[PDB]
Symmetry: C2
Protein backbone atom coordinates (compact mmCIF):
# COMPACT_ATOMS: atom_id res chain seq x y z
CA UNK A 1 0.00 0.00 0.00
CA UNK A 2 1.39 3.38 1.11
CA UNK A 3 4.19 1.51 2.90
CA UNK A 4 5.07 0.15 -0.55
CA UNK A 5 4.65 3.72 -1.84
CA UNK A 6 6.84 4.85 1.07
CA UNK A 7 9.68 2.42 0.27
CA UNK A 8 9.36 3.24 -3.44
CA UNK A 9 9.51 6.93 -2.52
CA UNK A 10 12.72 6.18 -0.59
CA UNK A 11 14.05 4.09 -3.51
CA UNK A 12 13.42 7.04 -5.84
CA UNK A 13 14.83 9.66 -3.45
CA UNK A 14 18.00 7.59 -2.93
CA UNK A 15 18.53 6.72 -6.62
CA UNK A 16 18.13 10.38 -7.64
CA UNK A 17 21.16 11.33 -5.50
CA UNK A 18 23.48 9.12 -7.60
CA UNK A 19 25.38 11.08 -10.33
CA UNK A 20 24.24 10.31 -13.89
CA UNK A 21 20.63 9.67 -12.84
CA UNK A 22 18.06 11.81 -14.67
CA UNK A 23 15.01 10.66 -12.69
CA UNK A 24 13.37 7.28 -12.22
CA UNK A 25 11.26 6.27 -15.22
CA UNK A 26 9.87 2.93 -13.99
CA UNK A 27 9.76 1.09 -10.69
CA UNK A 28 8.06 -2.12 -9.61
CA UNK A 29 8.50 -3.58 -6.12
CA UNK A 30 7.11 -6.48 -4.09
CA UNK A 31 7.85 -8.58 -1.02
CA UNK A 32 9.01 -12.17 -1.30
CA UNK A 33 8.81 -13.24 2.33
CA UNK A 34 10.19 -10.48 4.57
CA UNK A 35 12.48 -9.03 1.88
CA UNK A 36 11.86 -6.64 -1.00
CA UNK A 37 12.65 -7.38 -4.65
CA UNK A 38 12.62 -4.27 -6.83
CA UNK A 39 13.10 -3.62 -10.53
CA UNK A 40 13.93 -0.14 -11.73
CA UNK A 41 14.70 1.79 -14.89
CA UNK A 42 16.50 5.15 -14.63
CA UNK A 43 17.02 7.95 -17.12
CA UNK A 44 20.53 8.93 -18.25
CA UNK A 45 22.05 11.27 -20.86
CA UNK A 46 21.44 9.85 -24.37
CA UNK A 47 24.99 10.83 -25.37
CA UNK A 48 26.42 8.59 -22.63
CA UNK A 49 27.62 5.24 -23.91
CA UNK A 50 25.75 2.12 -22.75
CA UNK A 51 28.76 1.02 -20.67
CA UNK A 52 28.60 4.38 -18.85
CA UNK A 53 24.88 4.07 -18.14
CA UNK A 54 25.43 0.48 -16.98
CA UNK A 55 27.92 1.61 -14.33
CA UNK A 56 25.58 4.47 -13.32
CA UNK A 57 23.01 1.72 -12.69
CA UNK A 58 25.66 -0.22 -10.72
CA UNK A 59 26.19 2.81 -8.46
CA UNK A 60 22.43 3.26 -8.08
CA UNK A 61 22.29 -0.40 -7.01
CA UNK A 62 24.95 0.13 -4.31
CA UNK A 63 23.51 3.42 -3.02
CA UNK A 64 19.88 2.26 -2.86
CA UNK A 65 20.70 -1.15 -1.34
CA UNK A 66 23.01 0.34 1.31
CA UNK A 67 20.38 2.97 2.19
CA UNK A 68 17.45 0.49 2.45
CA UNK A 69 18.39 -2.82 4.11
CA UNK A 70 15.00 -4.50 3.47
CA UNK A 71 15.88 -4.89 -0.22
CA UNK A 72 17.28 -8.34 -0.96
CA UNK A 73 17.33 -7.70 -4.72
CA UNK A 74 17.36 -4.56 -6.89
CA UNK A 75 17.69 -4.77 -10.68
CA UNK A 76 18.62 -1.49 -12.36
CA UNK A 77 18.84 -0.79 -16.10
CA UNK A 78 18.55 2.46 -18.07
CA UNK A 79 16.78 4.43 -20.80
CA UNK A 80 17.49 7.69 -22.65
CA UNK A 81 16.30 10.91 -20.99
CA UNK A 82 17.00 14.39 -22.39
CA UNK A 83 16.87 17.35 -20.00
CA UNK A 84 13.53 18.96 -20.96
CA UNK A 85 11.94 15.59 -21.75
CA UNK A 86 8.24 14.71 -21.47
CA UNK A 87 8.17 11.67 -23.81
CA UNK A 88 8.79 9.25 -20.90
CA UNK A 89 7.24 8.82 -17.44
CA UNK A 90 8.73 10.08 -14.14
CA UNK A 91 8.06 10.05 -10.37
Amino acid sequence: GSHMEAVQNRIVEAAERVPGVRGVIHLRARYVGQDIWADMIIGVDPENTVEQAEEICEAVQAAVCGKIRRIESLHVSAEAREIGDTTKPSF
Copy 2:
Protein backbone atom coordinates in the same frame (compact mmCIF):
# COMPACT_ATOMS: atom_id res chain seq x y z
CA GLY B 1 2.15 -22.30 -20.67
CA SER B 2 4.05 -23.54 -23.74
CA HIS B 3 1.84 -21.30 -25.88
CA MET B 4 3.28 -18.43 -23.81
CA GLU B 5 6.70 -20.06 -24.30
CA ALA B 6 5.84 -20.32 -28.01
CA VAL B 7 4.97 -16.62 -28.39
CA GLN B 8 8.02 -15.67 -26.29
CA ASN B 9 10.12 -17.90 -28.55
CA ARG B 10 8.68 -16.00 -31.54
CA ILE B 11 9.28 -12.66 -29.77
CA VAL B 12 12.92 -13.67 -29.22
CA GLU B 13 13.41 -15.05 -32.75
CA ALA B 14 11.95 -11.87 -34.28
CA ALA B 15 13.86 -9.42 -32.04
CA GLU B 16 17.17 -11.20 -32.76
CA ARG B 17 16.81 -10.41 -36.49
CA VAL B 18 16.91 -6.64 -35.82
CA PRO B 19 20.40 -5.10 -36.30
CA GLY B 20 22.08 -3.98 -33.07
CA VAL B 21 20.46 -6.73 -31.00
CA ARG B 22 22.92 -8.95 -29.11
CA GLY B 23 20.36 -11.42 -27.75
CA VAL B 24 17.37 -11.05 -25.46
CA ILE B 25 18.37 -10.76 -21.80
CA HIS B 26 14.93 -10.55 -20.16
CA LEU B 27 11.36 -11.09 -21.28
CA ARG B 28 8.07 -11.12 -19.38
CA ALA B 29 4.72 -11.55 -21.14
CA ARG B 30 1.07 -11.91 -20.16
CA TYR B 31 -2.43 -11.60 -21.59
CA VAL B 32 -4.72 -8.74 -20.65
CA GLY B 33 -7.97 -9.90 -22.23
CA GLN B 34 -7.27 -11.32 -25.70
CA ASP B 35 -4.12 -9.24 -26.25
CA ILE B 36 -0.52 -9.70 -25.14
CA TRP B 37 1.49 -7.15 -23.15
CA ALA B 38 5.22 -7.86 -23.17
CA ASP B 39 8.24 -6.25 -21.56
CA MET B 40 11.69 -6.95 -22.91
CA ILE B 41 15.32 -6.02 -22.37
CA ILE B 42 17.82 -6.60 -25.19
CA GLY B 43 21.61 -6.60 -25.26
CA VAL B 44 23.53 -4.06 -27.36
CA ASP B 45 27.19 -3.05 -27.83
CA PRO B 46 28.43 -1.22 -24.70
CA GLU B 47 30.27 1.29 -26.90
CA ASN B 48 26.97 2.32 -28.53
CA THR B 49 25.54 5.52 -27.11
CA VAL B 50 22.23 5.29 -25.20
CA GLU B 51 20.42 7.16 -27.99
CA GLN B 52 21.64 4.49 -30.44
CA ALA B 53 20.46 1.62 -28.23
CA GLU B 54 17.13 3.41 -27.74
CA GLU B 55 16.49 3.48 -31.49
CA ILE B 56 17.61 -0.17 -31.77
CA CYS B 57 14.85 -0.87 -29.23
CA GLU B 58 12.45 1.22 -31.35
CA ALA B 59 13.22 -0.96 -34.38
CA VAL B 60 12.81 -4.11 -32.28
CA GLN B 61 9.40 -2.76 -31.24
CA ALA B 62 8.31 -2.26 -34.88
CA ALA B 63 9.67 -5.61 -36.11
CA VAL B 64 8.25 -7.73 -33.27
CA CYS B 65 4.84 -5.98 -33.25
CA GLY B 66 4.45 -6.24 -37.04
CA LYS B 67 5.45 -9.92 -36.94
CA ILE B 68 3.08 -10.87 -34.06
CA ARG B 69 -0.33 -9.17 -34.25
CA ARG B 70 -1.56 -10.47 -30.87
CA ILE B 71 0.75 -8.02 -29.07
CA GLU B 72 -1.10 -4.86 -28.06
CA SER B 73 1.90 -3.53 -26.11
CA LEU B 74 5.65 -4.22 -26.20
CA HIS B 75 8.08 -2.22 -24.05
CA VAL B 76 11.73 -2.54 -25.09
CA SER B 77 14.77 -1.12 -23.29
CA ALA B 78 18.43 -2.18 -23.33
CA GLU B 79 21.47 -3.33 -21.36
CA ALA B 80 25.19 -3.72 -22.14
CA ARG B 81 26.28 -7.01 -23.74
CA GLU B 82 29.85 -7.72 -24.88
CA ILE B 83 30.39 -10.41 -27.51
CA GLY B 84 31.78 -13.28 -25.40
CA ASP B 85 29.65 -12.33 -22.39
CA THR B 86 28.35 -14.69 -19.70
CA THR B 87 27.69 -12.13 -16.92
CA LYS B 88 24.05 -11.66 -18.03
CA PRO B 89 21.21 -14.07 -18.89
CA SER B 90 20.12 -15.08 -22.41
CA PHE B 91 17.47 -17.20 -24.22
